[PDB]
Amino acid sequence: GMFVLPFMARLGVTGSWSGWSITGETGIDPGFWSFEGVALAHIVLSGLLFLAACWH
Amino acid sequence: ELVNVVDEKLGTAYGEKIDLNNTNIAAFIQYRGLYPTLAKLIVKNAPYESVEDVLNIPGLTERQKQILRENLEHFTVTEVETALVEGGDRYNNGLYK
Amino acid sequence: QGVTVSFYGGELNGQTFTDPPTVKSYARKAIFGEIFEFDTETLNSDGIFRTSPRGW
Amino acid sequence: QTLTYDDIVGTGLANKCPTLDDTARGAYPIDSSQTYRIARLCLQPTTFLVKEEPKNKRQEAEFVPTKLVTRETTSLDQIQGELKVNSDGSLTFVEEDGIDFQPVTVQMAGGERIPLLFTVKNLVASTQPNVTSITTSTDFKGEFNVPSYRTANFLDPKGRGLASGYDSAIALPQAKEEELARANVKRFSLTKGQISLNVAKVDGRTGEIAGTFESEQLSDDDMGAHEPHEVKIQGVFYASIEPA
Amino acid sequence: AELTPEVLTVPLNSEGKTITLTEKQYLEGKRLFQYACASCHVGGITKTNPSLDLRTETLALATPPRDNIEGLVDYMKNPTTYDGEQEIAEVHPSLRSADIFPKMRNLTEKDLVAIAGHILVEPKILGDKWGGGKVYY
Amino acid sequence: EINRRVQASLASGATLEEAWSAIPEKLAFYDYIGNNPAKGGLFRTGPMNKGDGIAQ
Ligand code: CLA
Ligand code: HEC
Ligand SMILES: CC1=C(/C=C/C(C)=C/C=C/C(C)=C/C=C/C=C(C)/C=C/C=C(C)/C=C/C2=C(C)CCCC2(C)C)C(C)(C)CCC1
Ligand SMILES: CC1=C(/C=C/C(C)=C/C=C/C(C)=C/C=C/C=C(C)/C=C/C=C(C)/C=C/C2=C(C)CCCC2(C)C)C(C)(C)CCC1
């Protein structure tokens, strides 16, 4: 039932910070741009747009 | 089925006597002459196939054998329960006061 | 202490139990007074006591 | 030049096995009539690998790498015992005493912590036959005991344990016990583990050998509440041979 | 209840003779016990070795029996292990190791009898509280 | 009341099985702590059957 997870993987986000990847390969490190790093980048962006909306 | 092996061992002679294969060393205080000298030697030279094998610990004096022979009635031997002997629990089983 | 349990009346009338796990499980139920068979499956009963309308 | 506690403390060097210079490609003559002794055996794990559980029966049951989470607490050190020359000039090492276990927790991809009692308890390891000199080709191979990761006084969070504690779930005074039985009845496991020590460097003069090891043993089964994982432990060793 | 003669009558030796302590030497014994012994034997246990206590039934099974005044006084002069095999004066307070246990220095024979009396009387008063530990607090 | 009826039955020559088999299930069921209204919890919701089960 994964809806957004294939969209992240399609453009190259393969891994989790918890250490698995979507291909099943054991022992890659994704750096910042894991699935959690993408999600965090969207939440942060959501809050910054919220503040900008207030200002405008 | 699934059984608590320590609870099951209380149904044996371990529940009623000093098991030379299993009982923690502090139970040797219960009778005169065992602790700590003979108790240390009994725990160290375990396991025993019978109680009377306790008179074959080497280096015992003559009075030491006489102490043990007085106390053979208070001793028993069972199978080595690993739950009671691992971790050094025969010397310190976390029971104090 | 060689504890056994025998039942008089009820479902287990005339039965006697000697193996210490079984005797213990009945002793733990005996702290509640009389011992009853319970259908826990119909309501998905959780095993934790509830109060009566008198209490509510 | 030889360090003290004040140089060592807080640096992590205390968790390391001692090493040997590259020059020490020597050989330690075993006199077949003398009694020898291991004065100090140290095992420093470097890698912990855990076997995965494919729900399939089949598949590749491969050993996967794990991250250590319990810090530099992993080495076994100060292990002693007799090194008995046998009939055929094989040496057998009988472990007597030392710091021969360490609880270790590793973490798998996904966050599963795997606790294990990394141990060489009651190690009986033997060489090949016809070994007059301990060389850089000697391989000790042996079996040890893996006792339960918790001992019998350990209480679970609901106060259940083996030699102590409740035998039931007291929070659910009228639940059906028969499905709680695996959690209610604690069981002390005792398993066998298998180690192979490969000599790589012998100081033939001093009698200090060093090399690598590989150990295979089960992880913790949590007093029988779940199935343990197969763990492979790889690292380095140092031993010091001494005539008793 | 009062602190009668009959409470204060304790076995003097092992043969069978008793001595009846006065209330003054009971209270000097409790004071001297507190000053010299209670840091390890508060309430009749033993903090640094809980396997051995000061219950009269444990003192009776010691070698030689310590469940009388003369046996207790001798222990304070020459303490042994529970089987009487090792002298332990280098690690237990006594008059022969009063150089290393300086609270033992000025204890007289009447002081040791008073301490020995307190150890024997106190279980007749406290019951299982004496030597029972925190379960009986 | 249960013990009274039993002892009256045992004073008339009943066996132990006969004495206890005469005690009504209704009377024994009142002698059971899971029917005590002081055994519940504020957020333990629902009928008493939801705890221990439906008594059979
Ligand atoms: C006097 C009122 C009263 C009493 C004693 C009962 C009693 C009962 N009801 Mg009934 N019921 C009532 C009124 C009552 N009801 C009303 C008014 C309705 C319509 C909503 C119902 C609808 C109803 C249903 C649908 C069911 C029951 C059931 C039951 C039984 C189970 C009780 C339970 O689980 O409660 C649980 C009680 C609590 C969880 C307590 C709630 C705590 C409150 C809400 C906290 C609020 C705090 C407040 C906001 C603080 C303000 C702070 C501010 C001032 C600063 C029990 C016999 C059940 C049953 O078994 O039927 C067969 C069941 O299924 N009742
Ligand atoms: C701790 C620092 C102690 C102080 C102070 C005193 N004692 Fe003690 N006592 C201590 C230990 C560790 C032991 C056990 C020694 C052993 O290995 O056997 C004891 C033992 C005794 C006993 C014997 C108890 C028995 O059951 O036989 C007695 C009677 C005794 N100690 C008395 C005693 C007195 C009177 C003390 C004050 C002067 C005193 N002890 C000090 C530890 C310590
Ligand atoms: C229950 C349920 C569910 C869930 C759901 C969900 C989860 C949803 C959510 C939803 C959401 C979550 C929504 C949101 C919304 C929002 C909005 C709508 C907003 C708005 C805003 C605004 C309006 C703003 C304003 C402002 C400000 C603030 C400032 C600046 C300016 C302005 C004015 C602009 C599901 C389906 C699963 C299932 C079934 C049931
Ligand atoms: C570069 C880069 C990138 C990108 C990024 C981005 C995308 C950014 C964005 C940014 C943003 C998006 C920003 C924002 C900002 C905001 C702000 C700065 C705001 C502020 C506000 C304010 C100041 C306001 C105030 C107020 C309020 C709050 C309330 C009311 C009143 C007022 C109005 C006063 C990436 C990562 C990809 C990569 C790398 C590089």
Swiss-Prot record, chain B:
Pfam families the record matches: PsbU
Keyword terms: Electron transport, Membrane, Photosynthesis, Photosystem II, Thylakoid, Transport
Family: Belongs to the PsbU family.
Domain of life where this protein originates: Bacteria
Subunit annotation: PSII is composed of 1 copy each of membrane proteins PsbA, PsbB, PsbC, PsbD, PsbE, PsbF, PsbH, PsbI, PsbJ, PsbK, PsbL, PsbM, PsbT, PsbX, PsbY, PsbZ, Psb30/Ycf12, peripheral proteins PsbO, CyanoQ (PsbQ), PsbU, PsbV and a large number of cofactors. It forms dimeric complexes.
One of the record's GO cellular component terms: extrinsic component of membrane
Gene Ontology terms: biological process: photosynthesis; photosystem II stabilization
Membrane topology: Peripheral membrane protein
Task of the protein: One of the extrinsic, lumenal subunits of photosystem II (PSII). PSII is a light-driven water plastoquinone oxidoreductase, using light energy to abstract electrons from H(2)O, generating a proton gradient subsequently used for ATP formation. The extrinsic proteins stabilize the structure of photosystem II oxygen-evolving complex (OEC), the ion environment of oxygen evolution and protect the OEC against heat-induced inactivation. Requires cytochrome c-550 (PsbV) or OEC3 (PsbO) to bind to photosystem II (PSII).
Intracellular or extracellular location(s): Cellular thylakoid membrane
UniProt keyword Cytoplasm, yes or no: no
Keyword Electron transport recorded: yes
Record InterPro entries: PSII_PsbU
Lineage: Bacteria, Bacillati, Cyanobacteriota, Cyanophyceae, Thermostichales
Cofactor binding, note field: PSII binds multiple chlorophylls, carotenoids and specific lipids.
Listed name of the protein: Photosystem II extrinsic protein U
Swiss-Prot record, chain D:
Primary localisation category: membrane
GO biological process, one term: photosystem II assembly
Record-linked InterPro entries: OMP/PagP_b-brl, PsbO
This protein's record includes keyword Repressor: no
Alphabetized GO MF terms: oxygen evolving activity
Membrane topology recorded in Swiss-Prot or TrEMBL: Peripheral membrane protein
Family classification: Belongs to the PsbO family.
Name used for this protein in its record: Photosystem II extrinsic protein O
UniProtKB/Swiss-Prot annotation, chain E:
Name of this chain's protein: Photosystem II extrinsic protein V
A cellular-component GO term for this protein: photosystem II
Highest taxon in the source lineage: Bacteria
Biological processes, Gene Ontology terms: photosynthesis, light reaction; respiratory electron transport chain
Membrane topology: Peripheral membrane protein
Cofactor: heme c
Listed GO MF terms: electron transfer activity; heme binding; iron ion binding
Protein family (similarity comment): Belongs to the cytochrome c family. PsbV subfamily.
The entry's keywords: Electron transport, Heme, Iron, Membrane, Metal-binding, Photosynthesis, Photosystem II, Signal, Thylakoid, Transport
Localization of this protein: Cellular thylakoid membrane
Residues of the full protein shown: 27 to 163 of 163
Keyword Membrane in annotation: yes
Protein function: One of the extrinsic, lumenal subunits of photosystem II (PSII). PSII is a light-driven water plastoquinone oxidoreductase, using light energy to abstract electrons from H(2)O, generating a proton gradient subsequently used for ATP formation. The extrinsic proteins stabilize the structure of photosystem II oxygen-evolving complex (OEC), the ion environment of oxygen evolution and protect the OEC against heat-induced inactivation. Low-potential cytochrome c that plays a role in the OEC of PSII.
Amino acids binding heme c: C37, C40, H41, H92
Subunit comment: PSII is composed of 1 copy each of membrane proteins PsbA, PsbB, PsbC, PsbD, PsbE, PsbF, PsbH, PsbI, PsbJ, PsbK, PsbL, PsbM, PsbT, PsbX, PsbY, PsbZ, Psb30/Ycf12, peripheral proteins PsbO, CyanoQ (PsbQ), PsbU, PsbV and a large number of cofactors. It forms dimeric complexes.
Primary site of residence: membrane
Entry keyword annotation includes Transmembrane: no
From Swiss-Prot, chain F:
Protein location: Cellular thylakoid membrane
Entry superkingdom: Bacteria
Leader sequence segment: none
Function: One of the components of the core complex of photosystem II (PSII). It binds chlorophyll and helps catalyze the primary light-induced photochemical processes of PSII. PSII is a light-driven water:plastoquinone oxidoreductase, using light energy to abstract electrons from H(2)O, generating O(2) and a proton gradient subsequently used for ATP formation.
Subunit description: PSII is composed of 1 copy each of membrane proteins PsbA, PsbB, PsbC, PsbD, PsbE, PsbF, PsbH, PsbI, PsbJ, PsbK, PsbL, PsbM, PsbT, PsbX, PsbY, PsbZ, Psb30/Ycf12, peripheral proteins PsbO, CyanoQ (PsbQ), PsbU, PsbV and a large number of cofactors. It forms dimeric complexes.
Similarity section: Belongs to the PsbB/PsbC family. PsbB subfamily.
Protein name: Photosystem II CP47 reaction center protein
Organism: Thermostichus vulcanus
Taxonomic classification: Bacteria, Bacillati, Cyanobacteriota, Cyanophyceae, Thermostichales
Gene name per UniProt: psbB
